[PDB]
Amino acid sequence: QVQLVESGGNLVQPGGSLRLSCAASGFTFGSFSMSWVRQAPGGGLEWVAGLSARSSLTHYADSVKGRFTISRDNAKNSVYLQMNSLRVEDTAVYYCARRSYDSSGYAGHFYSYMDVWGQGTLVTVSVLTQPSSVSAAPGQKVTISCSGSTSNIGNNYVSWYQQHPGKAPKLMIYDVSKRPSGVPDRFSGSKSGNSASLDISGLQSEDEADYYCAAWDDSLSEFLFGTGTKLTVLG
Numbered sequence: 001q002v003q004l005v006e007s008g009g010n011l012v013q014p015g016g017s018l019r020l021s022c023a024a025s026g027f028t029f030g031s032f033s034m035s036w037v038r039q040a041p042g043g044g045l046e047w048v049a050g051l052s053a054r055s056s057l058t059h060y061a062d063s064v065k066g067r068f069t070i071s072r073d074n075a076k077n078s079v080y081l082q083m084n085s086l087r088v089e090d091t092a093v094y095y096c097a098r099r100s101y102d103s104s105g106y107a108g109h110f111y112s113y114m115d116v117w118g119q120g121t122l123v124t125v126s127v128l129t130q131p132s133s134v135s136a137a138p139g140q141k142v143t144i145s146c147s148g149s150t151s152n153i154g155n156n157y158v159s160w161y162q163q164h165p166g167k168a169p170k171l172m173i174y175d176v177s178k179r180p181s182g183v184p185d186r187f188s189g190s191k192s193g194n195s196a197s198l199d200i201s202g203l204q205s206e207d208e209a210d211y212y213c214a215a216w217d218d219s220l221s222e223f224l225f226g227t228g229t230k231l232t233v234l235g
């Protein structure tokens with residue numbers, strides 16, 4: 001199997017620089033797209049920066065634009081994130097993910113979902129709406145609703161992630177309604193206008209987690225995550 005190993009995380013002063021790293025093993029990183037998503041302590045997911053597969057086109061998030069840089073190193077089978085002029089809000093665990101080539105899908109929409117995440121690395125410095133929380137009992141049925149706008153969800157492929165406290169996020173649904181190998185079919189995704197929906201029939205005790213949705217936003221030119229839903233199963 002494949003994995004991303006991250007290192008570089010450290011306690012630093014404000015204004016300091018710091019270089020994070022996301023190394024690939026089991027596969028060759030140069031032939032693949034990737035992203036950097038961070039998660040402040042007690043916050044939700046937030047896109048930061050990314051790399052296009054066949055070229056080397058970077059895109060950055062408005063917050064960290066001009067401070068952060070993202071190069072690759074085909075020789076060390078990895079990709080670095082150069083963070084400069086750090087600020088206290090940058091405080092968070094930074095994840096890195098590969099976006100595989102989507103067999104389905106189409107021109108300009110071939111790298112939509114993040115299917116292999118890293119384990120994360122802490123950097124300490126001295127939008128789409130979902131409900132805050134839903135609840136149910138085992139055997140029942142929840143529906144997590146993700147609503148946005150034309151710019152993003154109406155036009156673009158949407159994807160859902162799952163996340164137990166402390167662990168890295170996991171890909172549940174991509175391209176609106178598909179699911180990767182080894183995901184129970186009791187997970188179902190759909191879309192209707194400018195809002196998508198995650199569906200869990202036959203709820204179980206392990207399903208208890210945080211659920212995010214995500215989609216590219218054409219007008220902002222960023223990748224967007226939802227605020228997140230805390231699913232609670234009555235246990």
Ligand SMILES: O=C(O)c1ccc(-c2c3cc(F)c(=O)cc-3oc3cc(O)c(F)cc23)c(C(=O)O)c1
Pocket residue numbers: 033034035036047049050051052053057058059108109110111112113156157215216223
């Ligand atoms: O301007 C471009 O060529 C471009 C623009 C945006 C993306 C991009 C997309 C595009 C989509 F259509 C999606 O459904 C999802 C995305 O997700 C992305 C995530 C990354 O952060 C990144 F740097 C770029 C993209 C992208 C890519 O590498 O796939 C390339």
